[PDB]
Design a protein around this ligand. Structure first.
Ligand SMILES: *[C@@H]1O[C@H](CO[C@H]2O[C@@H](C)[C@@H](O)[C@@H](O)[C@@H]2O)[C@@H](O[C@@H]2O[C@H](CO)[C@@H](O)[C@H](O)[C@H]2NC(C)=O)[C@H](O)[C@H]1NC(C)=O
Ligand SMILES: *[C@@H]1O[C@H](CO[C@H]2O[C@@H](C)[C@@H](O)[C@@H](O)[C@@H]2O)[C@@H](O[C@@H]2O[C@H](CO)[C@@H](O)[C@H](O)[C@H]2NC(C)=O)[C@H](O)[C@H]1NC(C)=O
Ligand SMILES: *[C@@H]1O[C@H](CO[C@H]2O[C@@H](C)[C@@H](O)[C@@H](O)[C@@H]2O)[C@@H](O)[C@H](O)[C@H]1NC(C)=O
Ligand SMILES: *[C@@H]1O[C@H](CO)[C@@H](O)[C@H](O)[C@H]1NC(C)=O
Ligand SMILES: *[C@@H]1O[C@H](CO)[C@@H](O)[C@H](O)[C@H]1NC(C)=O
Ligand SMILES: *[C@@H]1O[C@H](CO)[C@@H](O)[C@H](O)[C@H]1NC(C)=O
Ligand SMILES: *[C@@H]1O[C@H](CO)[C@@H](O)[C@H](O)[C@H]1NC(C)=O
Ligand SMILES: *[C@@H]1O[C@H](CO)[C@@H](O)[C@H](O)[C@H]1NC(C)=O
Ligand SMILES: *P(=O)(O)N(CC)CC
Ligand SMILES: [Cl-]
Ligand SMILES: [Cl-]
Ligand SMILES: [Cl-]
Ligand SMILES: [Cl-]
Ligand SMILES: [Cl-]
Ligand SMILES: [Cl-]
Ligand SMILES: [Cl-]
Ligand SMILES: [Cl-]
Ligand SMILES: [Cl-]
Ligand code: NA
Ligand code: NA
Lengths: 527, 176, 176
């Protein structure tokens, strides 16, 4: 039996055998009042205190969210869909601890991605029991509200202030500050880590005054708040909040009434209308996301970044070789996960319309000009490869590289990885290559489970990443020091050295996508 | 190893085996086939060319080092022998500029570029292809040991080719 | 080597023999006696102390390294065992300051100096003997690796103790 006393009550966890050893798991600990009724659209309210033993023995409800129905029965897509009931009562977290109870363990806090519209901490690829077993860190993950329920904004007004779901993450970092010593954890050594929108989240907690003292270091996998999808403008957020009201017949004139009306709606009615709050979107649409709210976020975060207004600490930042591909089967003409997707120039062109909706014509010609100077015009997969690079360079790679540069210019050590390994078990076709989202199972150690059909070179690869991730968290330095590993150089403006992660040989390289990102970074923002 | 390292202390040869067979990992069936060739080309060509380049450059002259990685579309030798000794020459001499000739398009472009770099080196002491947004070829310095990779896809700047292998051939082996 | 290196690939042990028996030259009868002791003390004490000192100092702190070379006039062990493990301690603790005690004069002076350096280190973080025109003890840096020799005749500043030996223990051996 394993009972830990927390500030709000006792909690019982469960034992798990992992690799001939044991991890204790406390799945489903609540960390705020359920955000129902009067609390819907508001900042999470702190938790009341319960006598008796809360049983943390299974994953909790995931937050309400639309589901990916594009490929029913297909594991590639459905592995991302929620795997516990949806409910507004989803404000729970998970703790995994080494056995025996560590004395003062480093803490890794996972923040999932999903475009801020979806996702859940209980996915199999986010299971932190391998990290606990293997590295003897503590792993914490949390559910936070996504979609309108988590990010609806009517700026300035506490009935729907914006950013609630970032406040959910925050209040969870707080629970770790107050509660994690009880579990053997060191609150003074906490590293946040997250992928995609979860990484953008990590980057904004680097910017948020309220989060500054709730963690030590940050890891950002395929995401940063300067990505084009990551922050909704005040303009767009209002449009969207009013468009939502309109669609649920909740148009009022007293904004406080719009909200009271929206709180009478039922979760499905709200969910059902999210996709149409925008005239057009893309497979990468973030209808309801982070906004400048004057609370969590005090100013446009591009301004905060440029002017050095963020927590000073080491960062680890990374991306995957084919970020963009996964999106092309969600609406680009001629693409399919069921064939090789050789598209035409005219298809490439119609695809830019898919991903770059408004979108001066000259903007889009400029993307075509930059990405279609073939070397040479012979290769039939030319336009298929260009569309994916366009999508992942614009959306992930250049914004992560620009974040890393700017961040590092203020004096902190920063390490950048280029993930190039395609999973031996990937269900998506070969042409989609090293996809967005598919480093996560390496980071979490799923390939250390031999029962599991990954190659030997994949176990070794993941053991190494685990070790680098954990050394980063405990010591601010992502080195694997024991096995004659390539040394991971800090990333500096000027050199921009990054490390490549793959099964064959890892390399030190410089200036990832220098030519592409000059385009996205200097020129495109102008169109 | 007995074939290539005839006399050849037994310990010399175990040492080559030790250095080249710490598999990552012991699974791969072409492990020992790939190791024998690396042994032969690292000992005979690659490390001695890198050591020459270092030492030469330490006296003050500009030096440029390339790593040729393109396998000829027309190679008659089998695939496993990869990017073979002797098979950059036809790129240097421009044979792929002759279209009559069954080389790919990417090979014409690749050879046109090498020709241009070779010729600029000769006329101007600097192997740059200056017109077509080409990767700039950095001088090779001791300390950094930057080299340029030559292939059809993207050419790169890298550093310290075979650092671990050549420490072996270069510091240790000459002792056995 | 079998005594001291029990399991202990055969090649591991040949490698120690290779490194330590390239005689200069094969004439000297105490060659192998001297090599076994260096093997044992370099592997077990000297290189690991030098590697600790380097790595420690790379983080910014002042570090001072000594090489103790004086054999006690009263050593009961035979001459060939030279300046033995454990036999600086009585100098550090000042036993030679007791004249009643049959140590030479040069040993009193030697120990008075060490006592003074040890005590200045403790009180002030700097192991200098400042009054008697003593050799100044330089900090140990990676790069220079200056150390100070402690003996009755003249103390010296030297650099890179056992550079060649410890490259062996430190880079290579951990691999076998
Ligand atoms: C800000 O919002 C308005 C609202 O328009 C929308 O009405 C919503 C309830 C929803 O159904 C949505 O799909 C619909 O478009 C946008 O105005 C619309 O914009 C497009 C192109 O400009 C027009 O074709 C529509 O006719 C027009 N609708 C109305 C009623 O004015 C407006 O575009 C939007 N701003 C953006 C681009 O995000
Ligand atoms: C690769 O498949 C795409 C996707 O479209 C198809 O999916 C296939 C696997 C098959 O079931 C097909 O019937 C289904 O429609 C193909 O793109 C489609 O091209 C067809 C040919 O006319 C058009 O009718 C569609 O508009 C277009 N689909 C869309 C909406 O994008 C593609 O042609 C095929 N190409 C190959 C084999 O390279
Ligand atoms: C646990 O260690 C505490 C501090 O450790 C951390 O120091 C921080 C500044 C940060 O660098 C982390 O990465 C370090 O690990 C110490 O003050 C606590 O008292 C310790 N608590 C115990 C053992 O109960
Ligand atoms: C908690 O689980 C344990 C199982 O042993 C048991 O005491 C009890 O059923 C649980 N408490 C509940 C269900 O509230
Ligand atoms: C709008 O009416 C609502 C009813 O609760 C109230 O919240 C608010 O004070 C009113 N605002 C004004 C002053 O119009
Ligand atoms: C280090 O090496 C051993 C044996 O070669 C291996 O089993 C292990 O996976 C490695 N550890 C790390 C941290 O990669
Ligand atoms: C430069 O570019 C042109 C057209 O893009 C091409 O035909 C030629 O091969 C290139 N020249 C060199 C020196 O590579
Ligand atoms: C300094 O010198 C005096 C006289 O020369 C001597 O007696 C003494 O041992 C010395 N002190 C130290 C600290 O070595
Ligand atoms: P991520 O959370 O996967 N996301 C950024 C918006 C890609 C949809
Ligand atoms: Cl081509
Ligand atoms: Cl490596
Ligand atoms: Cl690149
Ligand atoms: Cl293998
Ligand atoms: Cl180029
Ligand atoms: Cl190499
Ligand atoms: Cl002799
Ligand atoms: Cl002196
Ligand atoms: Cl020496
Ligand atoms: Na332009
Ligand atoms: Na050796």
């Amino acid at each position: 039996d394993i009972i830990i006393a927390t500030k709000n009550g006792k909690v019982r966890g469960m034992q798990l055998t992992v690799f001939g050893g044991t991890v204790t798991a406390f799945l489903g600990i609540p960390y705020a009042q359920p955000p129902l009724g009067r609390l819907r659209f508001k900042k999470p309210q702190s938790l009341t205190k319960w006598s008796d033993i809360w049983n943390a023995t299974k994953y909790a409800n995931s937050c309400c969210q639309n589901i990916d129905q594009s490929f029913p029965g297909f594991h590639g897509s459905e592995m991302w869909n929620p795997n516990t009931d949806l409910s507004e009562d989803c404000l729970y977290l998970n703790v995994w601890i080494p056995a025996p109870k560590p004395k003062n363990a480093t803490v890794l806090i996972w923040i999932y991605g999903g475009g801020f519209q979806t996702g859940t901490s209980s996915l199999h690829v986010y299971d932190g029991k391998f990290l606990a077993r293997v590295e003897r860190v503590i792993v914490v993950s949390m559910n936070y509200r996504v979609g309108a329920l988590g990010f609806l904004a009517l700026p300035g007004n506490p009935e729907a202030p914006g950013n609630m779901g970032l406040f959910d993450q925050q209040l969870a970092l707080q629970w770790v500050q107050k509660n994690i010593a009880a579990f053997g954890g060191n609150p003074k050594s906490v590293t946040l880590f997250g992928e995609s929108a979860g990484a953008a989240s990590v980057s904004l907690h680097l910017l948020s005054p309220g989060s500054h003292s709730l963690f030590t270091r940050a890891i950002l996998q395929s995401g940063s708040f300067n990505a084009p999808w990551a922050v909704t403008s005040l303009y767009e957020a209002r449009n969207r909040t009013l468009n939502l009201a309109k669609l649920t017949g909740c148009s009022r004139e007293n904004e406080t009434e719009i909200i009271k009306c929206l709180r009478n709606k039922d979760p499905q009615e709200i969910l059902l209308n999210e996709a149409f709050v925008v005239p057009y979107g893309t497979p990468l649409s973030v209808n309801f996301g982070p906004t400048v709210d004057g609370d969590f976020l005090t100013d446009m975060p591009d301004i905060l970044l440029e002017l050095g207004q963020f927590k000073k600490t080491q960062i680890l930042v990374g991306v995957n070789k084919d970020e963009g591909t996964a999106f092309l089967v969600y609406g680009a003409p001629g693409f399919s996960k069921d064939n090789n997707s050789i598209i035409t120039r005219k298809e490439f062109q119609e695809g830019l319309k898919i991903f770059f909706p408004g979108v001066s014509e000259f903007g889009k010609e400029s993307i075509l000009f930059h990405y279609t100077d073939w070397v040479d015009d012979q290769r039939p997969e030319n336009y298929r490869e260009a569309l994916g690079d366009v999508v992942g360079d614009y959306n992930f790679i250049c914004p992560a590289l620009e974040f890393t540069k700017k961040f590092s210019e203020w004096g902190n050590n920063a390490f950048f990885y280029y993930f190039e390994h395609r999973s031996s078990k990937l269900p998506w076709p070969e042409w989609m290559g090293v996809m967005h989202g598919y480093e996560i199972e390496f980071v979490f150690g799923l390939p250390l489970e031999r029962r599991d059909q990954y190659t030997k070179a994949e176990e070794i690869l993941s053991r190494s990443i685990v070790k680098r991730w954990a050394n980063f968290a405990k010591y601010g330095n992502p080195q694997e020091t024991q096995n004659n590993s390539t040394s991971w150089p800090v990333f500096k403006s000027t050199e921009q050295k990054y490390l490549t992660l793959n099964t064959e040989s890892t390399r030190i390289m410089t200036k990832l996508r220098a030519q592409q990102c000059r385009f996205w970074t200097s020129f495109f923002p102008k169109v």
